[PDB]
Amino acid sequence: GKSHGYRSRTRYMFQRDFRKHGAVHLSTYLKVYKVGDIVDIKANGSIQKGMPHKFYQGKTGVVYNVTKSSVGVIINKMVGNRYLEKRLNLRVEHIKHSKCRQEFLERVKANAAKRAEAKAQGVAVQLKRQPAQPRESRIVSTEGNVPQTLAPVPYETFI
Amino acid sequence: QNPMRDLKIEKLVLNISVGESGDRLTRASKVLEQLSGQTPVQSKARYTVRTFGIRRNEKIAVHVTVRGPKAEEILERGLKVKEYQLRDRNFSATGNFGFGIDEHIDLGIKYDPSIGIFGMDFYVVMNRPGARVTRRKRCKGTVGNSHKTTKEDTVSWFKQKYDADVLDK
C-alpha cells in the first residue's frame, strides 16, 4: 500500500550538506533568542531530538517561548481556505535568526539619520524607497571607440 | 644528525597459538607465565573454522608483551637458540622483526612432563625515543619520516650489537 511516515520523502531535505557532516559548530548554541525574534527553519539531520516536521523546512516564524534547550516558534500554516496558527517546539540547532529583518532594521536607523540630519538643516528629505527608474539620457563618444561591425557567421560543423 | 634518535626495543611479545583450549592452553599459559613473570593474556577464536577444530570465542591461545630490561633478556636467550642468524625476510619494512622456535626448553626452563613442550612466536618491535606522541592522548600526532623505524636502519642496528647474521638475499 502507500506509506506516509513523519520523515518520509525527506531524502535530501534532512541531509547534511557536502563535506559538512559532523558535530554542529559551537556557535549554533551560543546564539541567544528572545520572544519576538524572527527565525528560519532548517532541520539538522544529525540532531534528531526536537526536530521539525518537513513541512516547516524553509518556513519562517516568530519565537513565542523560550525554554532550556528549545524555542517555541509559531507559523501560519494554511489548510483549506484559511490560515491556522501552528506552534513549533524546536531545538536551537534547527533554527537560525533571519536576515529578512536586517534590511528593515538597517533602514530605520539609517532613516533616523537622514531625518535628523535634514530637520536641523531645512526639511527637504524624501526617504521612501523608489524602484528602478528608467535611465536618463547620455552622450557616448566614439573617440578611441569606433564601432566594430558584426555580421552573422555561416554554418560550420566541427564534430 | 643523531642525538636521541637511538633505537631501543619498544617491547617483546611471545605468543603460543594452540589449536585448542583446556589443559593444553593453561599449560601454554603457565609456560609463558614463568618465562615472563607477568601473568599472561588469553585470546578467543575470531570465528569458526571446523577444519582447525575451533569455535568462535573459544580461548584459543595466549601471549604476552614485555618491554625494556627483561625483554632483551628473553630476546638474547632466544636469539641464542636461533644461533644469531635470521633471514632478510624476518624484518618488517616498518622496522620490527620476529622469529619462531620449537621447544621452550631451548632457552633455560626445565621440562616437567606435566607441562609438556611448546613453541613460541618471538616478535620484537623496535622504536625510538619520542615513541610517545603516537600513543599518548593529548596531541596524538605522527612521527616524521626521518625517525620512522625502517627495515634498513634495523638490520643495521641488529647486525651490530648481538653481532648476529642477516642471511639470505
Binding site: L26, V66, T67, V92 | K137, R138, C139, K140
Partner: protein
C-alpha cells in the same frame, strides 16, 4: 610513505577535515558542547569554566567565559606564580595544584567584590565541603571544572586544584571520590590523608624515606632542596605559609618586561622566513627547465 599507500586525488578531494582544535588533538568538543552551553532562557548569562591544565611541569588555572568571537578569560593564575608566596620547588605536584586553585579562587572573588564575604575554609583539615550560599545577600561565585583531556582518576592532581578553589571560597560543584584517601571498598573518605596530600605529606615522606635507604637517588632528584637546606618536616609550613601569603595578597603582579613588545617584534622577524612572489617562483621554474632539461 610507501608507493602502495599514498593518497588519491579523489581521497583528498572528498575529505572533510575535523575542526582544528581537534586535529590538533587539543579540544574535546563533545565536552565543550556540554560545558559551554547555557540554559536558553538564562539568556546572555555567561557559563564559566575553571580550566586546569598541566604543562610538562607548571600548572595552569584559567577562569573563562565563552563568546562566539572567542572565549573570555575573566581570571588567570599559573603555578609558576608560586615564588611570590613561597614555593620554588615542586610546582607540578598536587599541593602546588591546591595552591593555584586557592590562588585562583582568592584572586577572582577579590576582583569580583565577594572578597571579604566568602572566605572558604581557612582551617583545612580538608573535610568534604562546598562553599555554601550565605544567609541573605549574594550567592557565591559559581564556576565549573574544565578538566580538558585529563584522565579522571581517583587521586589525580587535576582535582587538587579543585579542592583548593573550593577552599578559597568558590562554588565549584563536586563529589569527593577523586580525592586521595577515598576508600575504594567503602564510599568513605580519610581526610587524614587528603590533609596530607594538601600539604605535600607524600613528597615529605618521600624526602624522608630516602634520607636513609639511598642517598644516591635523593641527591639527583630532591637536589634543589639541599641547595636551600630544607629537609622534609619544614615543608608542611612551606605550604601553610604559602597559603597565608596568598590569601592576604593575590592581586596579581605581572612581569616587568624589559624590552618592549615592538622590541620582541624585531628579534623574532629575524628567524622568520618569508613567502615568495609568483614572479620569483616563475624564474625558479624557468631556471629549472634551462637546467634539468636541455641535456646539461
Amino acid at each position: 610513505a610507501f608507493q602502495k599507500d599514498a593518497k588519491s586525488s579523489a581521497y583528498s578531494s572528498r575529505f572533510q577535515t575535523p575542526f582544528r582544535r581537534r586535529r590538533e588533538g587539543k579540544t574535546d568538543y563533545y565536552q565543550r558542547k556540554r560545558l559551554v552551553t547555557q540554559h536558553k532562557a538564562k539568556y546572555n548569562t555567561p557559563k564559566y569554566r575553571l580550566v586546569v591544565r598541566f604543562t610538562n611541569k607548571d600548572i595552569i588555572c584559567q577562569i573563562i567565559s565563552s563568546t562566539i568571537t572567542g572565549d573570555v578569560v575573566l581570571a588567570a593564575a599559573y603555578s609558576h606564580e608560586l615564588p611570590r608566596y613561597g614555593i620554588t620547588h615542586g610546582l607540578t605536584n598536587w599541593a602546588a595544584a591546591y595552591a593555584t586553585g586557592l590562588l585562583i579562587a582568592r584572586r577572582t572573588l577579590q576582583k569580583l567584590g565577594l572578597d571579604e564575604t566568602y572566605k572558604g575554609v581557612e582551617e583545612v583539615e580538608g573535610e568534604y565541603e562546598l562553599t555554601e550560599a550565605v544567609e541573605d545577600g549574594p550567592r557565591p561565585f559559581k564556576v565549573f571544572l574544565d578538566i580538558g583531556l585529563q584522565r579522571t582518576t581517583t587521586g589525580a592532581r587535576v582535582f587538587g586544584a579543585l579542592k583548593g578553589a573550593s577552599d578559597g571560597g568558590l562554588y565549584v560543584p563536586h563529589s569527593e571520590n577523586r580525592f586521595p584517601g577515598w576508600d575504594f571498598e567503602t564510599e568513605e573518605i580519610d581526610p587524614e590523608l587528603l590533609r596530607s596530600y594538601i600539604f605535600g605529606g607524600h613528597v615529605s615522606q618521600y624526602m624522608e624515606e630516602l634520607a636513609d635507604d639511598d642517598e644516591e637517588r635523593f641527591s639527583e632528584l630532591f637536589k634543589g632542596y639541599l641547595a636551600d637546606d630544607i629537609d622534609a618536616d619544614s615543608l608542611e609550613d612551606i605550604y601553610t605559609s604559602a597559603h597565608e601569603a596568598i590569601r592576604a595578597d593575590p592581586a596579581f603582579k605581572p612581569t616587568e618586561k624589559k624590552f618592549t613588545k615592538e622590541q620582541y617584534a624585531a628579534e623574532s622577524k629575524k628567524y622568520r622566513q618569508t613567502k615568495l612572489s609568483k614572479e620569483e617562483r616563475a624564474a625558479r621554474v624557468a631556471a629549472k627547465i634551462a637546467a634539468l632539461a636541455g641535456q646539461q
